[PDB]
Design a protein around this ligand. Structure first.
Ligand code: MN
Ligand code: MN
Ligand code: MN
Ligand code: MN
Lengths: 423, 423
């Protein structure tokens, strides 16, 4: 049958993972690849080349989401879509996102080798960026595909990066967004434009590895939020300003970072997380008291209400700390605060069937990380396929999934796509 | 008499202050001017030109200390020296250091206008740098003049900036250190090579302003120290690594910063200060748990032993925090730990006499900030003249000393130099 005929070039897929990892602003084994930079452009070209070699119709939208389509026997039907991202936060791994892009292309080649004849078209999506590194916005591409007018407006009017480069300027430097009449609404997909959307991704947790299982069938995605906070004080000479007269913005930040941890632990649930990944002091000189501090705070929970309580407590603590330290809470911005999503029940059903037909062990599980799937779920039925990764490591160079782990995920992806195409 | 004849071009001196501030990597009204950068080179040329116009014989040493001499009637005698620095930490003011260089040149012009004829030569020193911004080393020029073989060795062998540019490489780009065969010992001055050394400087405190006084006669300089600390953890995915499994290096840093403040307050003396002016996270991404954190801590006291006690407690707290957070204390380095200096009693007497002859109110007082005078005191009898500054602001763009305050300090400098020249 189709399932027994599926054959993946495992070392070849690994070789492509390794080649793509060379497009990096960090030295191997780390990867840094930020939206619209030269490294991102190089990686885009590499992926577009592979799409063309696999015989896909390749196109790009106004923000650089990249699409590769295999036309089905009934091309007017809503297509079955799959994809992920290739951007990489500073000093991260080679597998996050990339497995779902390179592995999707491989899934197409696997199906072509087996002589599969799609009814619904299959389309691979390289999302323009999923990481919030550059503009503080996560899933920038899929948020726009899912129709966020709020985001489109901000991208056109206010959004800049940490070097004060505007989104429009960055996009144009990489060959995109060159239309002054476009408010980016051109990117929006109609609900139902896809029959379904699947994303293959490394687990970013240790569960499949620990339990000796091949495949995770993802049933839900946890609810993510991010906050941007700034404190302002008088600053001045570290040696000359006596302690009673200070309002140290650095210490306000230190206190807020510890309060974040505290409020997370207050939830009484293991599923709650919160992190201060960014804490910067200005002017940032050893002999100058910080007059401004800037924190970027990530917090999530599978339970939206519990997550929201943490955010509310964090805001209360920021105000309490500001008053006690006699600094100004000059910014408290909820950059995003998104609900969790549920995978479509019939997509889950086909994925579990596919894994079973391939003699692969599997379990139902939730994603703790967020993914483009979170926002694609607003447009169409969604599912995710997890593969194991070593010790669950991710967002760091120790991140690892074996050639066989990837090949298994690719086979499940190929077979689920085929089932959905013929449905 | 000489005292009544002294007259300063106050708006002229202000114009020079403003012009020098233009040599900055930060936009007005802030100044940034770091050792050996292009802006530093431009500012050096500007000052050397003023020295030339004032009739001074100009020379430079191996590291770019700049000397301008007015030859006395007995030129073989040890000269009376005066000067300060012109480098500026990021986003600081335009009066710190600058007043003591531009004002020293103006003191020469003032004495010349009055027909004063020095017996001992007068020599103005532009110290190559006082701020520790580039290499973590404060008073680099005066530490070498005072004969630190340890510093000379490090500068030749290990010292680099945060961009891994070596001291030698940086120095050569600015036109200095062009001798392979110099161990920098050429910079060293013999004890007694100067009869006395004076530094005019803004108070960097609010005391003279609050008390309604013209001049501070500095009696001592507080004992400064600085430390570098690093913590290391495992890092990973901020959304997926559950709280019990973390060893967050950023939270370890937050805890140490608060410990610094606590230990300072434990001294029970208002003369004790401590600051965390630098706190950096790696990788520094919102969705990446910090795996490395880096703190640079400044701590001082007029009492050396009381400060050292703070330093010991900070080291103890760093170890306790590391163990509790389950991170490695990967670095704890005392970058400098220097004793206080006492101003020379005869210099103090002459300075107070000068202020009195000029009908300027004054008090004897301690300097809380450190200065090149701290190290020149090892070579020569030392004293400092403080002028008031607005609300004591320093190391920030709000720093301000009035044209009149500066002129008063220049007159006291002129008259004190004249007294010491004619001993
Ligand atoms: Mn990621
Ligand atoms: Mn990802
Ligand atoms: Mn200073
Ligand atoms: Mn200074």
């Amino acid at each position: 049958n189709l399932a027994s005929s599926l054959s993946v070039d495992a070392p070849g897929l690994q070789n492509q993972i390794d080649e793509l990892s060379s497009f990096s602003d960090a030295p191997s084994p780390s990867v840094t690849r930020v939206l619209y930079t030269d490294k991102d452009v190089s990686a885009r070209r590499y992926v577009k080349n592979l799409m063309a070699l696999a015989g896909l119709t390749v196109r790009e939208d106004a923000v650089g989401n990249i699409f590769g389509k295999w036309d089905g026997l009934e091309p007017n039907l809503p297509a079955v879509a799959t994809g992920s991202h290739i951007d990489a936060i500073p000093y991260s791994g080679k597998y996050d996102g990339v497995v779902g892009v390179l592995g999707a292309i491989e899934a197409i080649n696997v199906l072509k080798r087996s002589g599969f004849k799609p009814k619904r078209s299959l389309e691979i999506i390289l999302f323009t960026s999923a990481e919030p590194t550059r503009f503080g916005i996560s899933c920038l591409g899929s948020r726009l595909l899912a129709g966020s007018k709020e985001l489109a407006e901000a991208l056109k009017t206010t959004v800049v990066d940490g070097q004060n480069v505007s989104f429009i300027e960055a996009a144009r430097s990489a060959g995109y967004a060159e239309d002054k009449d476009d408010d980016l609404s051109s990117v929006f997909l109609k609900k139902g434009s896809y029959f379904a959307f699947l994303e293959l991704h490394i687990e970013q947790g240790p569960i499949l590895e620990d339990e000796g299982l091949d495949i995770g069938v993802v049933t839900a995605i946890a609810a993510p939020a991010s906050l941007k906070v700034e404190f302002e004080g008088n600053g001045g000479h570290a040696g000359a300003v006596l302690m009673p007269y200070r309002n140290d913005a650095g210490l306000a930040a230190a206190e807020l970072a510890l309060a974040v941890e505290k409020h997370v632990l207050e939830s009484e649930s293991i599923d709650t997380v919160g992190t201060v990944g960014i804490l910067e002091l200005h002017p940032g000189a050893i002999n100058s008291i910080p007059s401004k501090s800037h924190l970027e705070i990530d917090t999530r929970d599978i339970d939206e209400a519990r997550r929201n309580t943490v955010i509310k407590k964090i805001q209360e603590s920021a105000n309490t700390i500001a008053k006690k330290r006699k600094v100004k809470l000059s910014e408290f911005k909820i950059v995003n605060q998104d609900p969790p999503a549920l995978s479509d029940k019939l997509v889950i059903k086909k994925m579990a069937e596919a894994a079973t037909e391939l003699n692969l062990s599997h379990k139902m599980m939730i994603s703790r990380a967020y993914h483009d799937s979170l926002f694609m779920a607003r447009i169409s039925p969604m599912g995710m396929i997890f593969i194991p990764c070593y010790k669950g490591y991710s967002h760091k160079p120790e991140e690892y999934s074996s050639p066989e782990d990837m090949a298994n995920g690719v086979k499940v992806l190929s077979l689920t796509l085929a089932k959905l195409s013929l449905d």
